[PDB]
Write an enzyme that holds these catalytic residues in place. Structure first.
Site, short mmCIF file in Angstrom:
data_model
loop_
_atom_site.label_atom_id
_atom_site.label_comp_id
_atom_site.label_asym_id
_atom_site.label_seq_id
_atom_site.Cartn_x
_atom_site.Cartn_y
_atom_site.Cartn_z
N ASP A 85 0.25 -4.27 -3.85
CA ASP A 85 -1.26 -3.47 -3.79
C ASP A 85 -0.81 -2.19 -3.63
O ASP A 85 -1.12 -1.48 -2.76
CB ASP A 85 -2.13 -3.92 -2.72
CG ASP A 85 -3.43 -4.15 -3.40
OD1 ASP A 85 -3.74 -3.92 -4.70
OD2 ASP A 85 -4.44 -4.23 -2.72
N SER A 126 0.82 -1.11 -0.03
CA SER A 126 -0.12 -0.07 -0.04
C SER A 126 0.92 1.32 0.06
O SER A 126 1.65 1.74 -1.16
CB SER A 126 -1.08 0.00 1.04
OG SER A 126 -2.04 0.96 1.08
N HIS A 142 -7.57 -5.63 -0.06
CA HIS A 142 -6.37 -4.98 0.14
C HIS A 142 -5.75 -5.37 1.54
O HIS A 142 -4.55 -5.56 1.64
CB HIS A 142 -6.88 -3.40 0.59
CG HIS A 142 -5.59 -2.35 0.49
ND1 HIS A 142 -4.56 -2.28 -0.68
CD2 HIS A 142 -5.53 -1.46 1.50
CE1 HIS A 142 -3.77 -1.37 -0.38
NE2 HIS A 142 -4.12 -0.87 0.93
C1 LIG Z 1 -4.57 0.41 4.73
S1 LIG Z 1 -3.14 -0.52 4.97
O1 LIG Z 1 -3.38 -2.08 4.66
O2 LIG Z 1 -2.06 -0.07 4.14
N1 LIG Z 1 -2.35 -0.44 6.53
C2 LIG Z 1 -3.01 -1.11 7.76
C3 LIG Z 1 -3.33 -0.20 8.93
C4 LIG Z 1 -4.10 -0.85 9.93
C5 LIG Z 1 -3.84 -2.29 9.84
F1 LIG Z 1 -4.19 -3.28 11.05
C6 LIG Z 1 -3.45 -3.08 9.11
F2 LIG Z 1 -3.07 -4.48 9.09
C7 LIG Z 1 -2.86 -2.50 7.65
#
Ligand SMILES: CS(=O)(=O)Nc1ccc(F)c(F)c1
Length: 366
Positions: free
Chosen positions: A237, A214, A292
């Site tokens: 992703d 991300s 995601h």
């Molecule tokens: C939106 S994200 O996937 O990029 N970051 C994220 C934020 C909080 C979590 F608990 C997690 F597992 C991942």
């Protein structure tokens, strides 16, 4: 319920902070080791931060639910000696922090990688901490930094400054590990029972990769553009919004996009395709039915019905999805780091040759 590594090596885990300030490096290390007792989310403030990220006392509820959950690695177990290991620096997403991608870190470790999962101080982490001085560190008096929320007018500018800080943090993490590899003495601001001197002469300094999810996927691209020591990158992703227009044509290293199906959208895919060039190595696959969160550990922290409800799970099974991502990753890493393993058995996955994969993406762009 975070899956054990599927590889032959047993896996250890420790944390390293050096130096003690918020300008230093903070990372969680996964590594081939010589009890599966690692605390998944080790401080209450991480739960408070997650609650703020979620925009929701919600923090105390998360804490009660997940506060003693473990992840399958042996805490402070000694490093498996007698060999040099390839190195992955891993970058977390917006609202995450260093411990939330252990499913990936532990699987790469179990296949013979050392994985440095950094905790970013760019105020993209739900929470992180540092110490204001050595005296604070000595009595464990932490100073916490919570996620910054942004006005829409701010987003473009601040996200780009953040992805630049993230890339600098991945480079600094690498420089630290490489310095340790050649014998630099470090005093871990955390007083843990793992001697960092173990890492002397244990890194294959030519086999370095950066991986991230991300916001961490954009970080992969910024880091590759800025730091030629990284030999290839895998973007899980990727959220491409933070990147400046100038960077897309300035990525010399091989680059692998592994996408979920439901996260992606044209504005984001277009930016991935701007990274493409006839003279450069680029691959993309999409995991059918995935969302995601399939790349992060919370996809394993609830049951199927709750998980689907909260969009932690997709239609595809979470273990199947992470197995696909991990195996395709290992094949790409073997190919572009020049590993001497049998990961090329999954070369078909890089091309998207599987029932649960799409070659490239199903989104179309000009
Ligand atoms: C939106 S994200 O996937 O990029 N970051 C994220 C934020 C909080 C979590 F608990 C997690 F597992 C991942």
């Amino acid at each position: 319920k975070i899956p054990r590594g599927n590889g032959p090596y047993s896996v250890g885990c420790t944390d390293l902070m050096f130096d003690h300030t918020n300008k230093g490096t903070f990372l969680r290390l996964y590594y081939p080791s010589q009890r599966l007792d690692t605390l998944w989310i080790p401080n209450k403030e991480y739960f408070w931060g997650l609650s703020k990220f979620l925009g929701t006392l919600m923090g105390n509820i998360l804490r009660l639910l997940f506060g003693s959950m473990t992840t399958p690695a042996n805490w402070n177990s000694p490093l498996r000696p007698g060999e040099k290991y390839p190195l992955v620096v891993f970058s977390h997403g917006l609202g995450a922090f260093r411990t939330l991608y252990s499913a990936i870190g532990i699987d790469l470790a179990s296949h013979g990688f050392i994985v440095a999962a950094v905790e970013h101080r760019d105020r993209s982490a739900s929470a992180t901490y540092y110490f204001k001085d050595q005296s604070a560190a000595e009595i464990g008096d932490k100073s916490w930094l919570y996620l910054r929320t942004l006005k829409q007018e701010e987003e473009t500018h601040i996200r780009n400054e953040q992805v630049r800080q993230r890339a600098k943090e991945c480079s600094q993490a690498l420089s630290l590990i490489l310095d340790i590899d050649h014998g630099k003495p470090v005093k871990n601001a955390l007083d843990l029972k793992f001697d960092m001197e173990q890492l002397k002469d244990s890194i294959d300094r030519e086999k370095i990769a950066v991986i991230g999810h991300s916001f961490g996927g954009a970080t992969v691209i910024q880091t590759l553009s800025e730091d030629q020591r990284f030999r290839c990158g895998i973007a899980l992703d990727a959220w491409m919004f933070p990147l400046g227009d100038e960077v897309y044509s300035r990525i010399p290293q091989p680059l692998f996009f592994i996408n979920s199906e439901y996260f992606q959208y044209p504005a984001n895919i277009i930016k991935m395709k701007k990274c493409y060039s006839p003279d450069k190595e680029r691959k993309m696959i999409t995991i059918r039915g995935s969302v995601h969160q399939n790349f992060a550990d919370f996809t394993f922290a609830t049951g199927k019905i709750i998980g689907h409800m909260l969009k932690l799970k997709g239609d595809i099974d979470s273990n199947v999805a992470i197995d696909l991502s991990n195996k395709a990753s290992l094949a790409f890493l073997q190919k572009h780091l020049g590993l001497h393993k049998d990961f090329d058995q999954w070369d078909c996955l890089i091309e998207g040759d599987d029932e649960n994969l799409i070659p490239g993406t199903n989104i179309n762009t000009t």
